[PDB]
Point group: C3
């Protein structure tokens, strides 16, 4: 066989993947989301601000949903005085950026303090930075929740691996036209499947469902929630 020694970003990925597999009892919950209004909103602003993308808007709405479902942004801890869940006050949002040198996971520090435009600009800088290889050590660490946008790569739905010691990860399926029922009629709509993989020690099914339903409802009516645009 062609023998490839593993180093760098591959070695660390391989390390991080093994740690998660070993420690975290996972479960998964998925919801189908209609993205017509999301893309309409994008169309409204993309000329004046090209960084307002469906991905950026989704991350903004995710931050809102995490502020309302705090248990999703947390860590299981056993060190010391018995079993504890540490619920994090800051949302430091990791997201995958696939590059020539492999995938990197830039982090939006204190995403909870950012308005839609602020978040969109920062995500754009981080996407650019990952691609050009100019990210600092601080921009590649400290996440409390992570997103995997395999949809941008053409995957319809997927099951990503929790970024240890986080309690959950969100996978974003591909946005494309699919058939859905609206007012009893079969119609075409842009849609996507969201899949949350979670540490079932930390988060229960009722909690994940509440989070995902909220996220779906924000994305399906984003204009009011993003009234800071």
């Amino acid at each position: 066989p062609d023998v490839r020694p593993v180093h760098g970003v591959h070695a660390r990925m391989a390390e991080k993947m093994t740690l998660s597999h070993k420690e975290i009892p996972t479960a998964k919950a998925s919801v189908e989301v209609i993205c017509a209004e999301l893309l309409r909103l994008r169309d409204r602003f993309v000329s004046a601000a090209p960084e307002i993308t469906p991905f950026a808007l989704t991350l903004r709405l995710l931050v809102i949903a995490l502020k309302h479902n705090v248990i999703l942004n947390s860590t299981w801890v056993d060190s010391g005085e018995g079993p504890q869940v540490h619920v994090h006050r800051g949302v430091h949002l990791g997201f995958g950026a696939a590059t020539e040198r492999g995938l990197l996971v830039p982090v939006v520090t204190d995403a909870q303090d950012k308005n839609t435009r602020e978040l969109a600009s920062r995500v754009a800088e981080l996407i650019t930075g990952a691609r050009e290889g100019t990210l600092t050590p601080a921009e590649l660490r400290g996440s409390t929740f992570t997103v995997s946008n395999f949809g941008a790569l053409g995957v319809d739905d997927g099951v990503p691996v929790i970024n240890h010691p986080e309690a959950a990860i969100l996978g974003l399926g591909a946005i494309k036209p699919r058939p859905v029922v609206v007012g009893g009629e079969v119609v075409a709509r842009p849609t996507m499947t969201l899949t949350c993989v979670f540490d079932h020690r930390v988060v229960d099914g009722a909690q994940v469902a509440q989070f995902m339903c909220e996220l779906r409802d924000l994305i399906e009516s984003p204009e009011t929630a993003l009234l800071d645009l």
Copy 2:
């Protein structure tokens, strides 16, 4: 961070989740099921007996399918004289009931001996009991198979965790109108995705497929199988 010590129902969940993750090599099989006839049957009886719900009817049809696919209701055993599968004669059916105090898993003991009406009434008592916190220790133990109804919480499809030492768990996705093809035409129907997660030491793919196909076919033509109504 906000530090939450873990006790009670959370602590036991966290314990049960860890045990399953560690021991069970899982695989998953899903089938899409059309629920038009299921809801029609419900409509026929819900006035005189409000406990005949789609969930209750689904559990009844699940019991029938387990009686016909006995390997699904079993336990992997290594204690003693080598590897054994213990196939259980009784179907003691656990199901999730999410409550203020977390999720509980009431159990229908000897579900195999119950007719549709008997099962529906018992499920209703158990749902009430979980909500009001009046379940006995005996009503929270002894399951041989478990159902997770994340569909009632709005989740379209999901991957639940096997309730150790059981061999499989069934997830019930949300029932809602979705597009399907019937006689070559695209039509709206109420549908749901069923997902079975199974111990692949115990159950093989042919066995899970046979079980799930039977369950689908019962749900899609339930009137004859539930001729004890």
Copy 3:
């Protein structure tokens, strides 16, 4: 309980399932594939060569995709000089064949060297051999990649277990008519969901997406790629 001692093909399955669960940090990626052209191509040749099946054509197109995405056909190795990925030059394609005596996994040795007709004939011999119990030890070993055709058993989508020490497995969902959008219209098409489960130490998300998108595109326009017919 009815106590069943475990031997033979069941015992080895149980062994292989446990090994995979313990070692491999998995992730999963799925794509929906339209199969209209695949079945049209089959119709063209099934009279003169009954072994040209949708399954055989899918495996042929899979081999092509693996030749172009070599990392999918590989093994994680830690023995010796640190972490290595061994990329295999031969594609020795395992596939599930469910039989009276359980499931067997016949192997097409050097599948990369076979033309469409050669592969189709060999797959047919191997299906026959598994059913009649006439396979040699050599025809049941040495795979570098494995396929699980749970679709033939009626399963719409599934999550199979990697055949250790392989880096990935492909699940083939059931081919049937489902609604899809084509040129903005909701239409009926035969479709299937492909699910790849992969060792995330070996393969990254960009690599799996590239593989799966290629496989989808081959299946959706197979006539040119199978111009050796």
